[PDB]
Write a protein that holds these residues in place. Structure first.
Motif, short mmCIF file in Angstrom:
data_model
loop_
_atom_site.label_atom_id
_atom_site.label_comp_id
_atom_site.label_asym_id
_atom_site.label_seq_id
_atom_site.Cartn_x
_atom_site.Cartn_y
_atom_site.Cartn_z
N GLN D 34 0.80 -1.23 0.00
CA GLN D 34 0.00 0.00 0.00
C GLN D 34 0.83 1.28 0.00
N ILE D 36 0.66 5.31 1.61
CA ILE D 36 0.00 6.15 2.61
C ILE D 36 0.72 7.49 2.85
N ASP D 37 -0.07 8.54 3.06
CA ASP D 37 0.45 9.83 3.48
C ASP D 37 0.41 9.86 5.01
N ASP D 38 0.10 8.69 5.59
CA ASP D 38 -0.10 8.44 7.04
C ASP D 38 -0.67 9.57 7.91
N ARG D 40 -2.50 12.35 6.75
CA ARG D 40 -3.84 12.17 6.24
C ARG D 40 -4.14 10.67 6.28
N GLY D 41 -5.18 10.29 7.03
CA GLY D 41 -5.51 8.89 7.21
C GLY D 41 -6.02 8.15 5.98
N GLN D 42 -5.37 8.39 4.83
CA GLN D 42 -5.81 7.87 3.54
C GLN D 42 -4.76 7.02 2.84
N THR D 43 -5.24 6.18 1.91
CA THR D 43 -4.40 5.37 1.02
C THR D 43 -4.50 5.85 -0.44
N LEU D 44 -3.36 5.84 -1.14
CA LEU D 44 -3.24 6.51 -2.42
C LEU D 44 -2.85 5.61 -3.59
#
Ligand SMILES: [Mg+2]
Ligand SMILES: [Mg+2]
Ligand SMILES: [Mg+2]
Ligand SMILES: [Mg+2]
Ligand SMILES: [Mg+2]
Ligand SMILES: [Mg+2]
Ligand SMILES: [Mg+2]
Ligand SMILES: [Mg+2]
Ligand SMILES: [Mg+2]
Ligand SMILES: [Mg+2]
Ligand SMILES: [Mg+2]
Ligand SMILES: [Mg+2]
Lengths: 177, 136, 54, 104
Positions: D34, D36-38, D40-44
């Motif tokens: 995966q 992640i910008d960790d 920001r709690g998001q996956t890219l």
RNA sequence: UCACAAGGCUAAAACCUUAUGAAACUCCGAAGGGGCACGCGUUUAGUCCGGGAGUGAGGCU
RNA sequence: UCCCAAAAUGUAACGGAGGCGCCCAAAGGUCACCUCAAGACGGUUGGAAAUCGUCUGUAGAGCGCAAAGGUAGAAGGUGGCUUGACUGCGAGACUGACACGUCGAGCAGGGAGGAAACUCGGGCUUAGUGAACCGGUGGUACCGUGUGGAAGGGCCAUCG
RNA sequence: CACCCCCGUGCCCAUAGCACUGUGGAACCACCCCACCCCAUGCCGAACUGGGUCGUGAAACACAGCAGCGCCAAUGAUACUCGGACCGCAGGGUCCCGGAAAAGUCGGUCAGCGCGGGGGUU
């Protein structure tokens, strides 16, 4: 080696005796574990040379030197010194050395009607350590010095103690009567 | 009486008594009124006093206990060079706090054995009976 | 330091370079008993390796 | 025990390094790498393997590591930092690396 | 953590009910106290640079 | 270092306890990996305590020494390679009457471990120290007296 | 995230934890299988790890039930206390006005919010 298929003679020996839900859900035997704990007194380079040759010829596996747990009681103790030797035997070489036992170790025992059938690991496992060394297929007086003894602990994924009892016994074990 | 091992030394302060202001262990109970100090012998006193009165033998609960080291310098020196060696031991009894509980005797025995007890102490005192029921 | 101290003697590190340089530190002498081989910088160039000089 | 995973998880100084976390799950025969910008709690990114892998097992590595780095280069995400978890970095996940280490 | 009142119970140590003391104990923990900001509302001081000092024994609730 | 010290730093006493004048060539840099004290049962020497085994198990341990704060996502325990226990610096602050002392991003030359992002100009930290002066020593070629040299002196280093 | 559900991962650092318990298997997870070399054990494929299944739902993991334990916790009231005043030789204590716990009781709770992915709803 064959004791594998013997385990597999046990698999439904109890899956058909008990009433289990599954075949992995019946007590296997992770590791046999041998402790050559001279220690307390015996602090010679020669007795660990000996414990090494001995362990490495009987179970064909290198021995790990377990040291002083920093326990330095009133007597002769300190910090960094061998007070117990260890050789964990699991799976293959476990089954081989355990067969070395039931085949060429258990009868060889001078005075022997079976061993202690009282409830061991209350969790339903086992131990059994035993004195004497002069009852062996590998330990020879013609290849050693004086007399020593072993201390063994077998682990069984049993739920209770009756189930380990049964397991160990149907596997080739004498419970003295 | 005295204790076993410790810290050694002390100081002092006051303001009312924590616990336990309640009548456990006994039916009858004697209770301090003044922010005293109390000594090993000052209590062993009442031990031997009441223990005279009850005969064989009652049931006697010394709810207090000396833990405080009090000093006195060597007599006759000018101050400095130290703190005083430990003279004696003290229970820091504050008011409302209850010092003695007994039962296994009657009302008269409580009244009297407590009277004789309290005539040995630096404090006015009141004796009473249970009902303090936050926790038995 | 404290003169009549035999362990942790203070001795310097002279460069194999010959730059004209030396560091200065302290071995336990219950250790090396021969000398010391260290890899420090050297202003008069860049990276020498030093022998624990007398 | 857990220890190792949470150890590397914190040696990825969460966001403060600036860059982008790069997960993995090579403990099954279905993985999950995966992005992640960790902070920001998001996956890219997202290179799975459960929607048909290829056929390989640990050869699949370089491949979903090429698929990931592809979806990355597409997104715009041009910089790496390599999370793991309980993993040695040596074989399988190391392949995923090499072919992500030049694959996007 | 050191202390310690009764009682349980076992071979006492632990541990249960009942129970308490602590400047060098702390699951907890105010009132206050301090820094920064604001001045939303009053009041007067502040800070720097340069000249002259004296004081550096304090006393009581 | 800890109370005393009145919940900010600070604060006396011939007040109340205790410790330092070293140690570490790995006990440091990096990289990777491991988890503790005990109690119960069960086990050859043993059998209070040794060694092994299992169930419990957030700290009831460990940190070279003093305790307090700190610590299990490690500072604790084990290995690989290693000389960041490095010159040239110093944004900005803690602290002190002064002199000191304390922390430090970042830049350069040049390295070390990682595959990497990285981390390192000593150790979990706070004790392990002595200003000037005079002199020893290794560089350095600034001064050297009519001139060019050498004594001697200066600067960096450093030792008593 | 369309509805459930599983795999990875976060904000949240126990009203989110543990034990007792029932559901859970090809759909992911896990165990399992083998390992001469990669790679690894201070000894051992136990662990790190390379080959890949069936098999098992047992164990571990996930979900749900659950208030026995832990955790959280009122209001009232009190201690202490800012600042006003006072009493006792003194150890200490009171009055007015505000701030105001701790512990206990009432109770409260099997957390709650995201992102991406795979996988199903004749
Ligand atoms: Mg509470
Ligand atoms: Mg003076
Ligand atoms: Mg004064
Ligand atoms: Mg103050
Ligand atoms: Mg003063
Ligand atoms: Mg002089
Ligand atoms: Mg010179
Ligand atoms: Mg000269
Ligand atoms: Mg007042
Ligand atoms: Mg009030
Ligand atoms: Mg209020
Ligand atoms: Mg649940």
């Amino acid at each position: 080696q064959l004791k594998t298929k013997y385990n597999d003679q046990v698999r439904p020996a109890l899956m058909q005796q008990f009433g289990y839900s599954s075949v992995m859900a019946v007590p296997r035997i992770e590791k046999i574990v041998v402790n050559e704990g001279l220690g307390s007194s015996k602090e010679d380079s020669k007795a660990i040379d000996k414990a090494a040759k001995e362990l490495a010829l009987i179970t064909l596996q290198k021995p790990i030197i377990t040291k002083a747990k920093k326990s330095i009681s009133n007597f002769k103790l300190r910090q960094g010194m061998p007070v117990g030797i260890k050789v964990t035997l699991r799976g293959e070489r476990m089954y081989v050395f355990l067969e070395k036992l039931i085949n060429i170790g258990l009868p060889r025992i001078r005075d022997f009607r079976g061993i202690n059938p009282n409830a061991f690991d209350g969790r339903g496992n086992y131990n059994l350590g035993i004195k004497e060394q002069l009852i062996f297929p590998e330990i020879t007086y013609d290849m050693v010095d004086k007399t020593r003894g072993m201390d063994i602990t077998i682990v069984t994924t049993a739920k209770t103690d009756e189930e380990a009892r049964a397991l160990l016994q149907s596997m080739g074990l004498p419970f003295r009567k | 009486k005295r204790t076993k091992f410790r810290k050694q030394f002390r100081g002092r302060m006051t303001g009312d008594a924590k616990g336990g202001d309640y009548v456990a262990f006994g039916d009858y109970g004697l209770i301090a009124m003044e922010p005293a100090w109390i000594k090993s012998n000052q209590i062993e006193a009442c031990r031997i006093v009441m223990s005279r009165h009850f005969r064989r033998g009652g049931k006697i609960y010394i709810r207090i206990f000396p833990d405080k080291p009090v000093t006195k310098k060597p007599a006759e020196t000018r101050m400095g060079k130290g703190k005083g060696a430990v003279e004696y031991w003290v229970s820091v009894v504050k008011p409302g706090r209850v010092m003695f509980e007994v039962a296994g005797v009657t009302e008269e025995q409580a009244k009297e054995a407590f009277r004789l007890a309290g005539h040995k102490l630096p404090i006015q005192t009141k004796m009473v009976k249970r009902e303090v029921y936050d926790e038995a | 330091a404290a003169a009549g101290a035999a362990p942790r003697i203070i001795v310097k590190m002279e460069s194999s370079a010959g730059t004209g340089f030396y560091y200065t530190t302290t071995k336990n002498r219950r250790n090396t008993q021969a000398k010391l081989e260290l890899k420090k910088y050297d202003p008069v160039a860049a990276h020498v390796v030093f022998a624990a000089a007398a | 025990r857990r220890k190792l995973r949470t150890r590397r998880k914190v040696r990825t100084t969460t966001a403060a390094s600036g860059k982008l976390r790069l997960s993995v799950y090579r403990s099954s025969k279905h993985i999950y790498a995966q992005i992640i910008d960790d902070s920001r709690g998001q996956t890219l990114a997202a290179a799975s393997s459960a929607a048909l892998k290829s056929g390989n097992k640990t050869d699949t590595a370089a491949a979903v590591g090429k698929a990931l780095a592809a979806a990355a280069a597409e997104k715009g995400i041009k910089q790496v930092v390599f999370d793991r978890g309980s993993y040695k970095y040596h074989g399988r996940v190391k392949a995923l690396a090499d072919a992500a280490r030049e694959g996007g």
